[PDB]
Every structure is written in C-alpha cells, then in structure tokens.
Amino acid sequence: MLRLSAPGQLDDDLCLLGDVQVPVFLLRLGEASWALVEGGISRDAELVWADLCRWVADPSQVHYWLITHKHYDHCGLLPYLCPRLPNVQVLASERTCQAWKSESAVRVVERLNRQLLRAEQRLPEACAWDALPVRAVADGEWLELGPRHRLQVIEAHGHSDDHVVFYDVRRRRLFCGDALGEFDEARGVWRPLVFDDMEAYLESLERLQRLPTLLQLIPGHGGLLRGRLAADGAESAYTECLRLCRRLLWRQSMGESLDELSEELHRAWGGQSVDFLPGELHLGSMRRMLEILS
Ligand SMILES: C[As](C)(=O)[O-]
Ligand SMILES: [Fe+3]
Ligand SMILES: [Fe+3]
C-alpha cells in the first residue's frame, strides 16, 4: 500500500507505461497535452508504445519527454519512439545531451540495449541520436509543462555526473531516477548506487532532504513510493549509504577482499535487475561502488 507496482494509472494525472522494472511515466498536462518521464530500454519500445496509444489517441499531443540521466536504461527508447512523436521535445541536462552527440558513448548505449532484446525480437527504426529534439535544462530551472504542472530541475550528481531529478512542487512529487539508489522491494530500504562520486551523492541527498515533505517519490525502477517511504526517502537513502560504508570498513578490516565483497553484493542485490542489467555489469557496478566508498 506504500509502493504502487502495477502498470496503469497511479494518480489522476499520472500513469505507468511498460514494466515497473524500467517504467516510463505519462503525465496528462491538459485535454490535448501530455509528457513522458524517464527514457527506458530500447527493447521495450513496442510495449511502451502500445500502452501509450491506449491513453493518447493522438500521439502528436505528447509535448515533452523528461530524462534523468544518460545511463542506457534511462534513454534507450528515445531514438525509437521520438520518430512517432512529432511534437515531442526531450528535456535533459547539458551533460546528458552531450552523451548523445558522442559516437563512442552512443555505441555503448546501443550495445547494452541490444543485449536485452528478447529472442527473435526486432527493434523499430531508430532516428539519429544526434538529431533528437533536445532542449538542455539547467539546475533550478522551472519547467512550466502545463497550467497545472510546474516542475523544478534539481541537479543530483553522484550516481552519475549528469543526473538530475524533477520536482513537482504542487503535488510534492519527485522523479528521482537512481539518485536515491535501488529500492529494495523485499526489505523496504534503499540500496546505494554510488557509481561516480560519493561526496556528490551524499550532497545531493542532503539537498533533496530539504525539499518540502514528499508525498510521492518515483525512482527510475520499481514504481511509486508514498506515505512514509516518500517523506523519509532522501534521508533513508543517505543513511543507507553511510551504513554500507561503515559495514564495508568492518568487512575489509577482517580481510575480506573487494573481489569477494563485490561478488557477495552482486548475489545479494542482482536479482531485481536481472532482466534489464547484464549480471557482469551489475557485478562491475558493485565493485566500482565499493572502490569509491573505500
Ligand atoms: C543500470 As542502474 C544499477 O544505474 O539502474
Ligand atoms: Fe543509472
Ligand atoms: Fe537505472
């Protein structure tokens, strides 16, 4: 009752498209206007598209697509659905936009997204990554998407050096991507995802704690959190990061290698993302996190 984990309508203005493991959120801005939030994985294009069209009879009414960060599982749908969305404008940070103009970077994103295709699956036709209708948004920028939707852009680096989150001040609703970590569905706690910069990761969570009380907290994976899970989310994510650090120091101090400890974390936590993150990459991300924290 504190996490909404079924695709479909979540609120009067808000729907979850696709699978809850890598969801795309649909906002109704008006009678003839909509926005998407989060960019998904490429293999989900036809599923997300099918869901979309059952809510939006005219896809030319999809006007904005908000993107938290450049990781392959948060922008993989863009080249494949943007062509079907003639009036969409993609909103993303400056650093996120940069990645889509680099071929070495685009090659990685496309290669990862391809590893996720189902047996015998075919991707739609992709427009050019460097032709996406992007508009760079800045830290603190107010996005007036509609008469009842004003969302603030907030820089939230640490998980990645480009990550931003989008805060609907009216609805107390935060789209937070992976900045709080991965929500542990069985245990109800955040699993830290410190893959770039520990100091920035914690600083972002400090700032996000100072927002007005959250009523809805929407990460990049797992659905919508509400009640105390939203109100306490940023603070709990901070606590869980410090906790992992303290426990890492214990385990290392007893002689456990980063090799064994990363494999242990991989076994403990890889299960939730098995269907959208190759296990070798989850393991490597665990290893990088433990290196950063150490
Ligand atoms: C692919 As990930 C662990 O940054 O959500
Ligand atoms: Fe990520
Ligand atoms: Fe992610």
Author numbering: 18 to 311
In the authors' words:
The majority of traits controlled by rhl transcription factor RhlR depend on PqsE, a dispensable thioesterase in Pseudomonas Quinolone Signal (PQS) biosynthesis that interferes with RhlR through an enigmatic mechanism likely involving direct interaction of both proteins. Here we show that PqsE and RhlR form a 2:2 protein complex that, together with RhlR agonist N-butanoyl-L-homoserine lactone (C4-HSL), solubilizes RhlR and thereby renders the otherwise insoluble transcription factor active. PqsE is a thioesterase that triggers transcription of the RhlR regulon through a hitherto cryptic mechanism, which we identify here as involving a significant chaperone-like component that enhances the stability of RhlR via protein complex formation.
Interestingly, while the presence of two chains of RhlR was expected since similar transcription factors are homodimeric, PqsE itself was found to be dimeric as well. We, therefore, re-analyzed crystal structures of PqsE in the Protein Data Bank39 and found that PqsE forms similar dimers in all of these entries. After introducing a mutation in the dimer interface (E187R), we could obtain and crystallize a monomeric form of PqsE. Similar experiments with PqsE-E187R were more difficult to perform due to rapid protein precipitation and yielded an inverse titration curve corresponding to a KD of 13.8 ± 3.9 μM. These α-helices belong to the dimerization motif of PqsE and are unique within the metallo-β-lactamase family.
